[PDB]
Design an enzyme around this catalytic site. Structure first.
Site, short mmCIF file in Angstrom:
data_model
loop_
_atom_site.label_atom_id
_atom_site.label_comp_id
_atom_site.label_asym_id
_atom_site.label_seq_id
_atom_site.Cartn_x
_atom_site.Cartn_y
_atom_site.Cartn_z
CE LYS A 120 -68.46 56.72 82.43
NZ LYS A 120 -66.98 57.20 81.52
CB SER A 138 -69.26 54.26 72.40
OG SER A 138 -68.38 54.90 72.79
CE1 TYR A 139 -70.68 57.14 79.07
CE2 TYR A 139 -69.57 58.27 77.31
CZ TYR A 139 -70.69 58.08 78.00
OH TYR A 139 -71.13 59.21 78.17
CG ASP A 157 -63.45 64.29 73.10
OD1 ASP A 157 -63.54 64.86 72.11
OD2 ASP A 157 -63.88 63.34 73.43
CB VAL A 191 -74.13 57.37 83.49
CG1 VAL A 191 -73.81 57.96 84.61
CG2 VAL A 191 -72.80 57.39 82.33
#
Ligand SMILES: CNC(=O)c1ccccc1Nc1nc(Nc2ccc(N3CCOCC3)cc2OC)ncc1Cl
Ligand SMILES: [Cl-]
Ligand SMILES: [N+]
EC number: 2.7.11.17
Length: 278
Positions: free
Chosen positions: A36, A17-18, A142, A21
């Site tokens: 990234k 989702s970010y 997390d 990479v």
């Protein structure tokens, strides 16, 4: 491939989702890194359209949290941030990490869990990594197998600082529910707003993580977030019949997954546990 400053961008190694990479080769130091690539407009949009004239840390702020935190860390069991390319005139934001060559230790669920010996080896790394973060006054929030990257050397590096919290004093005093639902400790899932301590949230997630290591799935599971949260609070921990695991490992997991954070095993105690000391 494509050129980005001194980097040659190559094979895509991740997409989430970010952002994406990429494997990146640095021409100045003849070394490979993970780059990234994120879009600022996309991160902003991911929060949802702003409301016309409690609100969580939006995705862009999670990215910038991660930058701020990783700038101050240096430990072999924590991924290193090497460089950030952030031009106020570009939409793209680039975060360059040290390459952790084998990628995430596990995708959950899996039919191929780790052996006890491999679980122990990685768990030892996790303990060192978390002990360091806590010492630096960071609650990760997390911890999970997919956030544990296995290096060329066979050791784990902790990644993904987006929902982490820094604190002063002995511990964080937290009231918000963040991170990954299957890994969230029962005291963070109360109906009424409550205050709970930070270090114990990380121990709980470490417990769920170690259960995943040896069993390939979480101890509490449901596709519906709300029913999952209810099971985390109300279901007694159970182990499957197979694979059979050692009694000392079942004891450790049980003590990390104590539903009461007041009695949950702490890291100094985990370091002394017979299963950990082999
Ligand atoms: C939090 N998770 C991540 O940062 C992440 C998720 C998916 C893929 C990559 C990834 N991040 C990294 N990944 C790596 N290294 C990887 C990861 C996966 C891979 N895969 C290549 C294809 O086969 C499976 C393994 C290779 C690799 O380096 C050669 N190094 C540093 C970082 Cl920060
Ligand atoms: Cl995971
Ligand atoms: N990361």
């Amino acid at each position: 491939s494509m050129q980005l400053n001194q980097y040659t961008l190559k094979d895509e190694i991740g997409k989430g989702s970010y952002g994406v990479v990429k494997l990146a080769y640095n021409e100045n130091d003849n070394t490979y890194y993970a780059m990234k690539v994120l879009s600022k407009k996309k991160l902003i949009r991911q929060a949802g359209f702003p409301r016309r004239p409690i609100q969580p840390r939006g995705p862009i702020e999670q990215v910038y949290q991660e930058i701020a935190i990783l700038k101050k860390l240096d430990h072999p069991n924590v991924v290193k941030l090497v460089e950030v390319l952030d031009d106020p005139n570009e939409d793209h934001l680039y975060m360059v990490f040290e390459l952790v060559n084998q990628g995430p230790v596990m995708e959950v669920p899996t039919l191929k869990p780790l052996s006890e010996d491999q679980a122990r080896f990685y768990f030892q790394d996790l303990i060192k990594g978390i002990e360091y973060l806590h010492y630096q006054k960071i609650i990760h929030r997390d911890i999970k197998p997919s956030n544990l990257l296995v290096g060329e050397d066979g050791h784990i590096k902790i990644a993904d600082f987006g929902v982490s919290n820094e604190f002063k004093g002995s511990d964080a005093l937290l009231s918000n529910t963040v991170g990954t639902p299957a890994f969230m400790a029962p005291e963070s899932l109360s109906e009424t707003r409550k205050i709970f301590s930070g270090k114990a949230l990380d121990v709980w997630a470490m417990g769920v993580t170690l259960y995943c290591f040896v069993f390939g799935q979480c101890p509490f599971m449901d596709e519906r977030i709300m029913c999952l949260h209810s099971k985390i609070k109300s279901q007694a921990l159970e182990f499957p019949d197979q694979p059979d695991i050692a009694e000392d490992l079942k004891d450790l997991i049980t003590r990390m997954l104590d539903k009461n954070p007041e009695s949950r095993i702490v890291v100094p105690e985990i370091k002394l546990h017979p299963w950990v000391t082999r």
